[PDB]
Amino acid sequence: TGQVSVEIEWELQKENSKRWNPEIQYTSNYNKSVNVDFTVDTNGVYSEPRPIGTRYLTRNL
Amino acid sequence: TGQVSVEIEWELQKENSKRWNPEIQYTSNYNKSVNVDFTVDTNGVYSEPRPIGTRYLTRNL
Amino acid sequence: TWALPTYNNHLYKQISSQSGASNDNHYFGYSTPWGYFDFNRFHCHFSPRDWQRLINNNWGFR
Amino acid sequence: VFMVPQYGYLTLNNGSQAVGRSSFYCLEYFPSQMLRTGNNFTFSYTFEDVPFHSSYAHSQSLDRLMNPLIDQYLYYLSRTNTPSGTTTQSRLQFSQAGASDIRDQSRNWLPGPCYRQQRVSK
Amino acid sequence: DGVGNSSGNWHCDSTWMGDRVITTSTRTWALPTYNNHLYKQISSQSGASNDNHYFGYSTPWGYFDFNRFHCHFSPRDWQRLINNNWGFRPKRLNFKLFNIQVKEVTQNDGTTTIANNLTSTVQVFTDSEYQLPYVLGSAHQGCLPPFPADVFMVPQYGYLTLNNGSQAVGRSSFYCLEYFPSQMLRTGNNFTFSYTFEDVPFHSSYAHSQSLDRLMNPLIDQYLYYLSRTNTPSGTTTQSRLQFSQAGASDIRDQSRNWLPGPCYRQQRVSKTSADNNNSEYSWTGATKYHLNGRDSLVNPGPAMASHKDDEEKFFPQSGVLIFGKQGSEKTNVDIEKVMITDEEEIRTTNPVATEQYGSVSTNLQRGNRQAATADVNTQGVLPGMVWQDRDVYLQGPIWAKIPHTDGHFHPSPLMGGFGLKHPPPQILIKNTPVPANPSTTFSAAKFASFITQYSTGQVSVEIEWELQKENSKRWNPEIQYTSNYNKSVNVDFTVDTNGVYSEPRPIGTRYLTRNL
Amino acid sequence: DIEKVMITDEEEIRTTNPVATEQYGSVSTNLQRGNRQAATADVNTQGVLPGMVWQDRDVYL
Amino acid sequence: TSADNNNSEYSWTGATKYHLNGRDSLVNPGPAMASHKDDEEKFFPQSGVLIFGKQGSEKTNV
Amino acid sequence: DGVGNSSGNWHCDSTWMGDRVITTSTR
């Protein structure tokens, strides 16, 4: 047994949009729930509730 | 008559949170509508549909 | 782009509340031929997207 | 396109009438640059240092700042009287606040000032 | 250096150098594996009243706290400090974790076998950036013990976030402590780090010798007039005539004064003698409280204000003072003799009495056909010109507290007393690294549950440097100092009994020297 | 009518700021004793007291 | 004006005061606040203003 | 160094620097 550690460096292409109206972003729901999303429950079991895909910002063709 | 132009420089305090679960952000609704939010209608009348307040990110006390 | 008329026909005027007005609503002042610029509302400088960019990402600004 | 607002100001008043202290200002008394077509007017300003406006909402309430697992070491007045046979007798009893009685934990801080309002519903 | 070379040397002495004091204290600690190495979500019980709801998490991490004064000062050291100094404050601190021990317990067959595990490690990290909820300064248990000999058990870290009753709102924050880089230690390693406090005002260790109401010269009259008498006799029936006078020794209550006492949020008054107190359950219904988000929360201790007027040592505010427990006191519903109730008579010169109303104010415009009426103020907000004294700090009392990160805090000195720091000493979190037992030879994606039982032990040492404001009084008659009683007793104060149990018999507050206003 | 305006919402500052509609707290107004029950009164207006913390009003677009 | 004022000894019972250590002490002058509204130069606070004596005024009950 | 000296220090943080991000994770 023992520890393993992986580090990765990622480059980014910053969003530069000049769109006027507000875009769509990813937000956790404001409403109350017995468990918060992406967190251990009463028995200590982490769980990813939904799949998150990278496409929320929009650009023209 | 004539043109007026005002420029302002604003300083920012970048969010540095180490929270694990995803935070709440401001997003326009995904659903279809006869008018998009924050845009001129059929007759060219711009309109701010809802008030937007600055408090969405969360920090501890 | 802005447009500026000639207010008060180029004359300073003294103005006050109406005799009928309740005591809470009395006032006395002047109206001037001058027009002023104001941009004290936030949307004057930020566009909705710009505003979105600002709130989502920053803890503070000034 | 917008229309420039018209400037006016209010000073002291005694009802409709204006008291002696009231100030009348002639705007022209101030030097003002005169522009013709093909001229421009620019000027620059730097704000004073001011505190950043918080664009965050706290994730922890003030009443809840303590650790749920460990009890405090300070005591509070839990129960003022205790049963004595059939009729209850005045006896003071103290306890240490814990998760069970969070409302009673000792705390360093107090909420913000309040001037109360009336409540109307949508 | 090596497995068999000690990481550090034990240090416990207080050394005084002019106006500076360094107090070092070393303790041995033990750290279990909390929550079986699993983060857990915790909340109040369905039955719990709405005032008692909460939602948060319990973490496998254990933290160090030393926010109690006796952790650093010995009773004699404390005596030296109060008698001699008008003020003091913390300057900087040094913290060390050395002689780390990790052991393994084999509990098969009803007999427990404990043995070294030189390979296993402890993860320690300091939250120097304050991205973790600060659980310090809430007067929790587990402080480095007052007595040096005692061994203590490291507290377990947990935190509370937003909640809507039992349920947790969307805004609630879940923090993974591991997400923070934490240095890993083996036996024969050490962890040290240093911190320097921010400039803060000295905590007054003096009690004023002059009351606020009395600051004037007894011999000379004022030159300002006050409304002495509103009406005067006119034959048989008295007539409305205004008369003015200059206040003097004779009518001291009337002298004009520049200053006002400190703000007051009023308390309920309960007496140490059972007889006086009313026979009813007013512990909560009669208590002074504030409201946040629909939850009534008891205001304890509350704004600093004297506990009792003259000759009323018998009384004390319901929740307006600190109350420490005598050694051996249980958790729930102890009798009065089992606690120690603190006493704030010192601040009465400038601070109101918690039980009494701040003042009287006139509420109606009088006239010929309407008598002059006034009403009491039980709650006065700060007004310009007020002066007050912050709450006292005791040997068993808290040292500091994190000022909440908000737009506005006014006079942000912790209400329990202590030093209100913006950037307080960072929380130190330590957790045994989990070690997996014999795994199954065939692969399985499910997470492990069969860890090797472990606990770690070792020494911890904290040093703090304190600055002093030496007493410079030119008073003629002798002052009041703190002295142990001359009389014989079966046990000396502040010492282990026949069975080796250290015990602090009484609370010691810093205010004995006196200065003028 | 109400539908013709937009009413702002300050739920964010509730963690440290009182609820505008509700009273700040309760304070005891009489000295109890054997023959006198313990009574308290609500405070609808509390001035700043030492130790208070609060959040300034939000700014909107 | 003597007439307006009520015919009673309210100099102390009716006065605004604060309490320190069980002693009621008159709050004079007290926090700065205007002495009278418009057109009420006739009135003044009981102990809310400064009062100087004209030259030659005695000590008690002038 | 030795049997009783830890080989490494635990790292898990993501740090953002302009258009670059470094994400480290230890298990």
Swiss-Prot record, chain E:
The gene is VP1. GO terms for molecular function: structural molecule activity. It comes from Adeno-associated virus 2 (isolate Srivastava/1982) (AAV-2). Disulfide bonds: none annotated. The lineage of its organism: Viruses, Monodnaviria, Shotokuvirae, Cossaviricota, Quintoviricetes. The N-terminus of VP1 is sequestered within the mature capsid. It contains a phospholipase A2-like region and putative nuclear localization signals. GO terms for cellular component: host cell nucleolus; T=1 icosahedral viral capsid. AAV capsids serve as viral gene transfer vectors that have been shown to affect long-term gene expression and disease correction with low toxicity in animal models, and are well tolerated in human clinical trials. It is found in: Virion; Host nucleus, Host nucleolus. GO terms for biological process: clathrin-dependent endocytosis of virus by host cell; symbiont entry into host cell via permeabilization of host membrane; virion attachment to host cell. Keywords: Capsid protein, Clathrin-mediated endocytosis of virus by host, Host nucleus, Host-virus interaction, T=1 icosahedral capsid protein, Viral attachment to host cell, Viral penetration into host cytoplasm, Viral penetration via permeabilization of host membrane, Virion, Virus endocytosis by host, Virus entry into host cell. This is Capsid protein VP1. The chain holds residues 219 to 735 of 735 of the full protein. Belongs to the parvoviridae capsid protein family. Capsid protein self-assembles to form an icosahedral capsid with a T=1 symmetry, about 22 nm in diameter, and consisting of 60 copies of three size variants of the capsid protein VP1, VP2 and VP3 which differ in their N-terminus. The capsid encapsulates the genomic ssDNA. Binds to host cell heparan sulfate and uses host ITGA5-ITGB1 as coreceptor on the cell surface to provide virion attachment to target cell. This attachment induces virion internalization predominantly through clathrin-dependent endocytosis. The ratio at which VP1, VP2 and VP3 proteins are synthesized in vivo is about 1:1:10, which is the same as in the mature virus particle. It comes from the Viruses.
UniProtKB/Swiss-Prot annotation, chain G:
Signal peptide: none annotated. It comes from the Viruses. AAV capsids serve as viral gene transfer vectors that have been shown to affect long-term gene expression and disease correction with low toxicity in animal models, and are well tolerated in human clinical trials. It is found in: Virion; Host nucleus, Host nucleolus. The ratio at which VP1, VP2 and VP3 proteins are synthesized in vivo is about 1:1:10, which is the same as in the mature virus particle. The N-terminus of VP1 is sequestered within the mature capsid. It contains a phospholipase A2-like region and putative nuclear localization signals. Capsid protein self-assembles to form an icosahedral capsid with a T=1 symmetry, about 22 nm in diameter, and consisting of 60 copies of three size variants of the capsid protein VP1, VP2 and VP3 which differ in their N-terminus. The capsid encapsulates the genomic ssDNA. Binds to host cell heparan sulfate and uses host ITGA5-ITGB1 as coreceptor on the cell surface to provide virion attachment to target cell. This attachment induces virion internalization predominantly through clathrin-dependent endocytosis. Belongs to the parvoviridae capsid protein family. This is Capsid protein VP1. It comes from Adeno-associated virus 2 (isolate Srivastava/1982) (AAV-2). The gene is VP1. The chain holds residues 491 to 552 of 735 of the full protein.
